[PDB]
Design a binder for this molecule. Structure first.
Ligand SMILES: *[C@@](O)(C(=O)NCc1ccccc1)[C@@H](C[C@@H]1CCCNC1=O)NC(=O)[C@H](Cc1ccc(F)cc1)NC(=O)c1cc2ccccc2o1
Length: 220
């Protein structure tokens, strides 16, 4: 496995988005993973619709702006046999009735793979598959104020994640050893948060914040 991976510089990652005041972290996390896999499959990088996921994934168990799972979004894409593009079904940060139009479908998947809960497998999956959809514990106030460096909430939980985010790679900082490894994580709170909307999560520090607890990716 390589020592550093960054899927942004290879063209797998859409620009950073802003979810607003609606609990659709899962939707954005699912669309990023599916964008990565669609690009790997065809070489075409198309922003997908979070609103479609929010509005139409009800039957699969999701709760719109009131919570959602990324596996449930992949299941909705598979059952629905399609996912509209961001441009056709633009984000409105609210719950609305499903307006899916198969004419504007630009993505689909045949299921999803759940990663074993250990950071080594997460590293392997990120290296070989691409951006991976994950969950982390971000309820602590420190996460709200992140700016740069490796983020390390001493009170983070490894088994109770509440935020879905995407992992676009991993790397290390050139310091004198002292466990410098980090996960490159993309967030959905815009660009003015963290490093242009990104965060370096602590890597190989005993599954800090349960990043490797709920890792999965859609199979196209
Ligand atoms: C999410 O991190 C977020 O969007 N935060 C910003 C925000 C804006 C407005 C209001 C609140 C937060 C957050 C969103 C939920 C729902 C909205 C209300 N409060 C929240 O905390 N997290 C999730 O939505 C979460 C993501 C997740 C996925 C996978 C995993 F292993 C852990 C977490 N999913 C749920 O909370 C959830 C999912 C389901 C599915 C079925 C029934 C109930 C569910 O609850």
């Amino acid at each position: 496995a390589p020592r550093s991976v960054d899927w942004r510089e290879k063209g797998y990652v859409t620009p950073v988005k802003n979810q607003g005041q609606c609990g659709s972290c899962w939707a954005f996390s699912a669309t990023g993973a599916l964008e990565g896999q669609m690009f790997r499959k065809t070489g075409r990088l198309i922003s997908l619709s979070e609103q479609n996921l929010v509005d139409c994934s009800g039957p699969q168990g999701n709760e719109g702006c009131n919570g959602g799972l990324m596996d449930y979004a992949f299941q909705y894409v598979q059952d629905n046999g399609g996912l509209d593009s961001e441009e056709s079904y633009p984000y409105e940060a609210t719950e609305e009735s499903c307006k899916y139009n198969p004419k504007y479908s630009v993505a689909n998947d045949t299921g999803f793979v759940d990663i074993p809960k250990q950071e080594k497998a997460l590293m392997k999956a990120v290296a070989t598959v691409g951006p991976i959809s994950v969950a982390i514990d971000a309820g602590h106030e420190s996460f709200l104020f992140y700016k740069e460096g490796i983020y390390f909430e001493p009170d983070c939980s490894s088994e109770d994640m509440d935020h879905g985010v995407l992992v676009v790679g991993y790397g290390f900082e050139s310091t004198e050893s002292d466990n410098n490894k980090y996960w490159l994580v993309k967030n959905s709170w815009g660009e003015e948060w963290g490093m242009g909307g990104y965060v370096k999560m602590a890597k190989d520090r005993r599954n800090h914040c349960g990043i490797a607890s709920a890792a999965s990716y859609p199979t196209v």
